Design a protein around this ligand. Structure first.
Ligand SMILES: Nc1nc2c(ncn2[C@@H]2O[C@H](COP(=O)(O)OP(=O)(O)O)[C@@H](O)[C@H]2O)c(=O)[nH]1
Ligand SMILES: [Mg+2]
Length: 167
């Protein structure tokens, strides 16, 4: 089993910090906001040895075979906003709508991620995000790429969402 995961969201929410934290177990001070790269790691999720294939999107809006491939053939999607960034949360609808267009489905496995929960500058409330994920029928996970809180949980929950879609 090998799960193909796509990390989407507005620029600056921490998509690249979340990915590097999962794969490389550390918080990167700086990561080129224009770099869009694919990352694989073997992990054990719920006693299940599997390989994760993660595309860290940059939102280049350019001709990419790999990115249009991961959007089409990617089986799960992390929808990431920042809890200190109201706009990125208002942006979540555009990203979910775009995913449903690439997959031809209502029920694509997805997770809503609220990153940077270590910050006190909170503009998006837990209930506000919980109440949106409720409408989509997807899970909501609170993360911080800096402290690693919820990083494994977010990525592993998405895999578990993928598992219930095969059944
Ligand atoms: N405090 C805090 N800062 C974060 C977190 N995640 C990302 N950042 C910062 O947010 C900025 C943008 O993050 P980045 O991963 O490049 O976002 P991307 O554009 O979506 O790829 C960087 O300066 C990071 O240091 C977090 O969980 N907590
Ligand atoms: Mg990035």
């Amino acid at each position: 089993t090998e799960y193909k995961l796509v990390v989407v969201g507005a620029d600056g929410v921490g998509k690249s910090a979340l990915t590097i934290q999962l794969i490389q177990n550390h918080f990167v001070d700086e990561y080129d906001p224009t770099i869009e790269d694919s990352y694989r790691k073997q992990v054990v999720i719920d006693g299940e040895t599997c390989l994760l294939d993660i595309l860290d999107t940059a939102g280049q809006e350019e001709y990419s075979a790999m990115r249009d491939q991961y959007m089409r053939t990617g089986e799960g999607f992390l929808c990431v906003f920042a809890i200190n960034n109201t706009k990125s949360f208002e942006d979540i609808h555009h990203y979910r709508e775009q995913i449903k267009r690439y997959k031809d489905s209502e029920d694509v496995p997805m997770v809503l991620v609220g990153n940077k929960c270590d910050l006190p500058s909170r503009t998006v409330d837990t209930k506000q995000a919980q109440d949106l994920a409720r409408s989509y029928g997807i899970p909501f996970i609170e993360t911080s790429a800096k402290t690693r809180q919820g990083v494994d949980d977010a990525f592993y929950t998405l895999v578990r969402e993928i598992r219930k879609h095969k059944e």
